Amino acid sequence: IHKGWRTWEYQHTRPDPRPFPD
Amino acid sequence: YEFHEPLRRKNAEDMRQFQTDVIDMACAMLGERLLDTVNASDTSSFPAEWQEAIAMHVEEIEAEMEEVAA
Amino acid sequence: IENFVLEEETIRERVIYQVVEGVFRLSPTSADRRELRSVANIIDYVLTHVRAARPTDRERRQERPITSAALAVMQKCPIQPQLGFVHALPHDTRDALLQEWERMHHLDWQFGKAVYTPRSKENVRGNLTWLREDRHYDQRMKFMQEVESGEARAKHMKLIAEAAGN
Amino acid sequence: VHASRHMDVETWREVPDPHWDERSYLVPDQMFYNIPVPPEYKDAYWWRELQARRVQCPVEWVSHRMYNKGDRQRYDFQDLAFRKKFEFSYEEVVKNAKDMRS
Amino acid sequence: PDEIEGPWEAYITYDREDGLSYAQSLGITTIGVATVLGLTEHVREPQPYAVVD
Amino acid sequence: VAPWVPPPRHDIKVTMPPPPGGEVGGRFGVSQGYSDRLARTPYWKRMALSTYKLRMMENATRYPMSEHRPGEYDIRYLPTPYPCTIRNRPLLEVGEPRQIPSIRIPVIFLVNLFDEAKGCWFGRRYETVYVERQFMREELMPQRYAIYATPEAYKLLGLPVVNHHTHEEIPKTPREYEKLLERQRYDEERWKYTIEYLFRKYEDGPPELLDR
Amino acid sequence: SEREAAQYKFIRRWELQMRDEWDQLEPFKGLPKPKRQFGNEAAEVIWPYALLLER
Amino acid sequence: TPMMLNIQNMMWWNGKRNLYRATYREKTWYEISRTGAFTKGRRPVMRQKYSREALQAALAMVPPGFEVADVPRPPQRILAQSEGIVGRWYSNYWTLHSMRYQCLLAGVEWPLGERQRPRT
Amino acid sequence: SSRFFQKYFIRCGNCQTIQRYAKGYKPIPNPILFDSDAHCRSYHRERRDCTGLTGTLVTCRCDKCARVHSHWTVMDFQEFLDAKLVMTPEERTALLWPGAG
Amino acid sequence: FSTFALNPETSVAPHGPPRGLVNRYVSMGLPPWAAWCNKVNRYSLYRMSGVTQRSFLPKPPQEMDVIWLNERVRERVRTSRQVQNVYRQLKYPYVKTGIHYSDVLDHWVQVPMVEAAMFEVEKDGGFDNFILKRSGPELRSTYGERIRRHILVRQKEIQKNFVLQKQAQMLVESMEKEILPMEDGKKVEEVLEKYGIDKEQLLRDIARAAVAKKQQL
Amino acid sequence: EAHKESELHQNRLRWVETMKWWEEIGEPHHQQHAASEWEWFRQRVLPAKAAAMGLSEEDAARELRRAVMHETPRWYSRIQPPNARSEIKEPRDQRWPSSPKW
Ligand SMILES: [Mg+2]
Ligand SMILES: [Zn+2]
């Protein structure tokens, strides 16, 4: 974290992992 | 039972040599107290055999002390 | 003085016949005569069979009864021992030779490990457990002096009296 | 169980001391229900007292109890036991608020 | 219900076999608001050895 | 899985919930105690099992002080249910340099101990002596010559009990320690501070009125 | 290097106390000097502040 | 530790979580931060108001030989709350003085002492 | 140290008499001639002083026996109220301060 | 902050609110460090108010092997004299090998502690009282529980030994009343078998109790 | 062991001078002094205060000396008492009557 992402603009929900499980 | 019995057994033998140790310390205290009645007070000791044997054992112990000293 | 003799065929043949069967009358096996190849081997062989020749405690307890009068006098003591405690100390499962190794060094007492050798009598001075519990014995003795005198009765009865009065 | 017990010397069995069982500290475990232990020795068992009182999963599975407000107030969080506190039904609430005439 | 204060009972376990006689020999009529009504041996169905084993 | 979930810790009392666990003893971090017995029991069965003497004794509110854990503040009242930091303090702060002047310990002697090297008595029997820390723990203590000055140590040996407040104040600076030393030797050797000891030179008239 | 210098100064101090070079009045330079007199020895003695708080 | 390295390890974000942290917080940093709720400034700390013969009975259960001046006001760290009239309610500072205020309103005579201001 | 006023109830340890001891305002060492080593440890000791004099050896003088000693024991006021309210009024005269009936 | 040369202690600060920027944060109850803060928002004030304590143990407490009673690995934010960079670093307690003669068991134990632990083990009355005073979760060190179990077992055998010698006292008091008179050589041995004591070992430690008192002299 | 260097040698030689002064003739004298003046105190003063303070001749000795603190060179609190009057702080650099800065 040389630079912090803007995390304050997201509501809290877990994204689906892109290598999605079958 | 296979687990528990070897335990109460050990407690039993522990109580046993507890009694044994009590008796032996009774022997020791008899030793110093009868010693105290014989040397400090007077007129009374046990048989000449007891006295002679006691003396012999004392001499042997003293020899062991002289040997273990060096 | 420090002479550790390593055996051979013939000197084993005569030394064992002279020493352990002549003096100690001890009986070797074939495996024995396989392993008797030092002076340390022969000495702890003889030592082992001699210490095995000595009576166990079961034989000593049946030559020495504890007489009813003695045990009765032991019964009339105000205190009898607790005597479960040995089962509380931690046992660890490891090699026996590493246990040999750690008190070969000073490593056995360090990391919370300690070795337990049951004692009989202790060091009484500067022993803080000893003192507190013999103080306790003193007040139990003066307590029974109070009981045999009868003030215990009076104290309890006046407790009941002041409970009834309130 | 065999610690700190007086011996009865006739039978050489343990004396069944009635005071033993009120001083005793019950140590939980899985393949036994609870194990009575003398109190002085209770202090080494402090961790599996905390594992028994713990919720029996990863806390991530039950974490939803934590985040919403209504489930903070209705659930017990002491040493990680997520378990419903006692909570009235609706008819109870109605008849509890009604007889106070409110 | 706080005006009722009915006959509380107390089960008192003495570690010896003489507890009853001792309890009467204490001679307690009142602990001073309570006025103990009666002392009697609570009869237990004797427990087997399996309970302390 | 857990057969027999253990009961709440301090729940001995009938109508009021137990103190929060971790205050009694256990894992810290919740401000309210809870027990399913005391909750599930109907209100009337709580009141039936009580009286207005007993109820007011366990309704009792000790405000900031906590009963079970003496001297500290009660955790529920603290903003974060974890215990107070300051009484639970570490000796050195983050920026605090470590300069701790050697401290010496009041110690009760168990035997008359004579120093051969210095030709003087280390200490007499039952006499409290301030000694070096390592000299105490490494030598006096492993032998039976001496033990610590704790008040219960005075209690056990049958001596009249006094408290030396050992390490009540631990000096983090050397001058702090000489302040500590000065008040200490004002307390323990107080015969130094009586006026006759100030006047050692005059137990008589002035020194110039004498003979040769 | 403060500790050993400290030691040095203490031994030095006791040496001058055996041999009578030690001036006990040095902290007192700014004060006027009391009466040197046959009863006034209560003045020259350095008083602890504590027993002055006591009486 | 990554919190030192400033990584945002929140579980909604990447699925990780900061390793040295408590898994339960009964009040998070925002509602710890609000000291207006916690401390008693401008806020009533006793929410029931007793009638006259209630107040008199409550005062009647105070043991004699008690001064108000023996109950120091707790610091800011300590939460301000009153458990109502419980046993030993006079040991509670805020309960003591709230009761004092009701006794001032209802015209009940105040048996205890009053708070002293010590000065140098 | 110290920014705020505080009241303590201390027991004289020799004779066991309870007297009260106060701590008043003394100013911060000057912010303009700045010393971090002064200010910061002053801060930590300030926090300490505020909590029951935890790490401080208390030194005062007994009124009932007039001498200066550090035997003092600092009591939180609930332990004080436990100590005081169980006393007969004639031993309040001996052990406690004037009045405090 | 007072500019006056002499400042006797006052009940309340006499000049009103103390002036200066540092006295602001002092009156707020914050540390003096706050005069160097650029971000003064709620979160930073909460952060440095110190109510939340941020620090950690090296291992989880169940797995903690050394006595860290209170020393949490802390962290410190410092600044170079090239002031444009600000770096923080972890700080650890000074853990010193405890070698303490344990009193109840006669022997030393080397169990690692911290400095605080040693000062406090001096304060407590010795290693054993220190280990027993703590309970449970208070000592997070496994080593601690091990030597604690040894200490308890050892204590109970101290009690056992005491009890033992008391038994001995009752025996010798009881039989001395019998053998206090001289009587006869034969009569004594009846008492020797009435209680069950062997005669020859009695002679032996009579001879050793002897050897013992003249040896010292 | 450099001797040809002046102040490196004669100063550590001054050190060994000082510390062979102590443990031979200095230390036994200091210890003997401390012993001798307590010995002076207890048969002259103490018999007065045992009568005065209301104790016995024995328990007054345990009260007036509660502990033995004998002074060895690595333990000493102060060499001499702190100054009675501390000199007065002038303004910054000899400004008069006052300075704006610090
Ligand atoms: Mg829900
Ligand atoms: Zn006093």
Q: What is the 3 state secondary structure string of chain F? A: CCCCCCCCCCCCCCCCCCCCCCCCCCCCCCCCCCCHHHHHCCHHHHHHCCCCCHHHHHCCCCCCECCCCCCCECCCCCCCCCCCCHHHCCCCCCCCCCCCCCCEEEEEECCCEEECCCCEEEECCCCEEEEEHHHHHHHHCCCCCEEECCHHHHHHCCCCCCCCCCCCCCCCCHHHHHHHHHHHHHHCECCCCCHHHHCCCCCCCCHHHCCC
Nearest to J74 by CA among C20, F89, I27: F89
At H20, list the tokens: 């040295």
Distance CA I75, CA I9 (A): 5
Q: Cβ–Cβ of F27/D50 closer than 8 Å?
A: yes
Orientation of helix H52-60 relative to helix H93-105, angle to 10°: 140
Find the helix or strand (DSSP H, E) in which C13 lies: helix C9-18
Resolution for this experimental structure (Å):
3.4
Locus of tokens 């005073």 = J133
- All chains having 3 or more CB pairs closer than 8 angstroms to chain K: F, G, I
Within 8 A of F174 by CB-CB distance, chain G residues are 2
Local structure of residue K65 (DSSP, 8 states): B
Locus of tokens 């105690």 = F33
Find the helix or strand (DSSP H, E) in which I93 lies: helix I89-95
The sign of the CA dihedral D19, D20, D26, D29 is negative
Give the other-Cβ count within 10 Å of C52's Cβ. Answer: 8
Distance CA K3, CA K1 (A): 6
Find the helix or strand (DSSP H, E) in which J118 lies: helix J115-123
Instruction: Give the three-class secondary structure for H37.
Output: helix
On whether the CB atoms of residues J191 and C60 are closer than 8 A, the answer is no
Distance CA F89, CA D68 (A): 35
Instruction: Give the three-class secondary structure for C43.
Output: helix
* End-to-end Cα distance, chain C: 89
On whether the CB atoms of residues K59 and F160 are closer than 8 A, the answer is yes
Beta pairing class for F146-148 and I6-12? unpaired
I50 annotated binding-site participant: no
Report which residue type is found at C45: Y
Min Cα–Cα distance to chain H from F62, Å: 7
Q: Cβ–Cβ of J70/F88 closer than 8 Å?
A: yes
Orientation of helix C128-149 relative to helix J142-179, angle to 10°: 50
Nearest to I7 by CA among H71, B22, C111, D99: H71
Task: Provide the residue count of chain K.
Answer: 102
On whether the CB atoms of residues I6 and J12 are closer than 8 A, the answer is no
At I67, list the tokens: 């001498």
* End-to-end Cα distance, chain B: 55
| CA distance readout (Å), I53 to B54, D81, F168, I1, J124 | 69, 37, 10, 13, 20
Nearest to D23 by CA among D34, D45, D38: D38
Distance CA F147, CA F151 (A): 12
* End-to-end Cα distance, chain G: 42
J49 lies within 8 A of chain F by CB: no
On whether the CB atoms of residues I14 and I71 are closer than 8 A, the answer is yes
What is the helix, strand, coil percentage profile of chain A, to 5? 0, 0, 100
Distance CA J126, CA J118 (A): 10
- Report the alpha-carbon angle K66-K70-K75, nearest 5: 115
- Report the alpha-carbon angle J110-J111-J113, nearest 5: 125
Chain C residue with the nearest C-alpha to that of E29: C164
Give alpha helix (H) positions in D1-102.
20-23, 46-50, 64-67, 70-73, 90-98
- Report the alpha-carbon angle D76-D82-D83, nearest 5: 70
Q: What are phi and psi of D84, to 5 degrees?
A: -55, 130
- Report the alpha-carbon angle K54-K57-K60, nearest 5: 60
Locus of tokens 């006990």 = G24
Q: Chain centroid to CA H47: how far? A: 12
D66 lies within 8 A of chain F by CB: no
Q: Cβ–Cβ of H1/J51 closer than 8 Å?
A: no
Nearest to G5 by CA among J130, K18, I92: K18
Distance CA G17, CA G24 (A): 10
The number of the ligand nearest the C-alpha atom of I14 reads: 2
At J139, list the tokens: 């000592």
Give the other-Cβ count within 10 Å of I61's Cβ. Answer: 15
Report which residue type is found at C19: V
Find the helix or strand (DSSP H, E) in which I73 lies: strand I73-75
Report which residue type is found at J102: S
Q: Chain centroid to CA D79: how far? A: 11
The sign of the CA dihedral B54, B60, B61, B63 is positive
Q: Which residues pair with J110 in a beta bridge?
A: J99
Cβ burial E4-21 (10 Å sphere, 16+ → b, else e): eeeeeeeeeeeeeeeeee
Task: Note the maximum CA span of chain K.
Answer: 67
Q: Cβ–Cβ of G6/K81 closer than 8 Å?
A: no
No. of helices (H) and no. of strands (E), chain K: 4, 0
Distance CA H97, CA H118 (A): 18
At J184, list the tokens: 């006869």
**Which 24-53 residues of chain K touch chain F by CB within 8 A?**
27-28, 31, 35, 37-38, 40-41, 44-46, 48-49
Q: Cβ–Cβ of D16/E52 closer than 8 Å?
A: yes
Chain K residue with the nearest C-alpha to that of I30: K102
On whether the CB atoms of residues F61 and H88 are closer than 8 A, the answer is yes
C67 lies within 8 A of chain E by CB: no
Q: Cβ–Cβ of D47/J62 closer than 8 Å?
A: yes
Instruction: Give the three-class secondary structure for I21.
Output: strand
Q: Which 3-state string (H, E, C) describes J194-208?
A: HCCCCHHHHHHHHHH
Count residue pairs from I and K with Cβ separation < 8 A.
3
Residue I71 CA to ligand 2 center (angstroms) comes to 9
Residues 6+ positions from C45 with CB-CB distance below 8 Å: C20, C26, C28, C32, C36
Chain C residues with at least one Cβ partner in B under 8 Å: 57, 61, 64, 66, 70-71, 74, 81, 83-84, 86-87, 120-121
Locus of tokens 């007793």 = H50
D2 lies within 8 A of chain J by CB: no
Residues 6+ positions from A7 with CB-CB distance below 8 Å: H8, H10, H13
Report which residue type is found at H24: Y
Task: Provide the residue count of chain D.
Answer: 102
- All chains having 3 or more CB pairs closer than 8 angstroms to chain I: F, G, H, J, K
Q: Chain centroid to CA C72: how far? A: 25
Q: Which residues pair with F129 in a beta bridge?
A: F107, K68
Within 8 A of J142 by CB-CB distance, chain C residues are 112
I12 annotated binding-site participant: yes
On whether the CB atoms of residues F74 and F60 are closer than 8 A, the answer is no
Within 8 A of H8 by CB-CB distance, chain A residues are 1, 4-5, 7
Q: Cβ–Cβ of G7/K73 closer than 8 Å?
A: yes
Cβ burial F184-203 (10 Å sphere, 16+ → b, else e): bbbbbbbbbbbebbbeeeee
Distance CA C44, CA J166 (A): 41
On whether the CB atoms of residues F201 and G44 are closer than 8 A, the answer is no
Distance CA F73, CA I53 (A): 13
Instruction: Give the three-class secondary structure for C55.
Output: coil
Locus of tokens 């495996």 = C31
Min Cα–Cα distance to chain F from H22, Å: 9
Within 8 A of C82 by CB-CB distance, chain J residues are 156, 159-160
Burial class (CB in 10 A: 0-12, 13-18, 19+), H94: buried
- All chains having 3 or more CB pairs closer than 8 angstroms to chain E: C, D, F
Q: Cβ–Cβ of E29/C166 closer than 8 Å?
A: no
Q: What are phi and psi of I6, to 5 degrees?
A: -150, 145
Q: Which residues pair with I15 in a beta bridge?
A: none
Distance CA I32, CA J23 (A): 12
On whether the CB atoms of residues F109 and F127 are closer than 8 A, the answer is yes
Distance CA K102, CA I32 (A): 7
| CA distance readout (Å), I4 to D28, D86, G25, H60, J29 | 50, 45, 40, 35, 10
On whether the CB atoms of residues F157 and C124 are closer than 8 A, the answer is no
Q: Cβ–Cβ of G41/F206 closer than 8 Å?
A: yes
Q: Chain centroid to CA D102: how far? A: 38
Q: Chain centroid to CA F205: how far? A: 48
At K40, list the tokens: 């002076």
Count residue pairs from H and J with Cβ separation < 8 A.
26
Report which residue type is found at E25: S
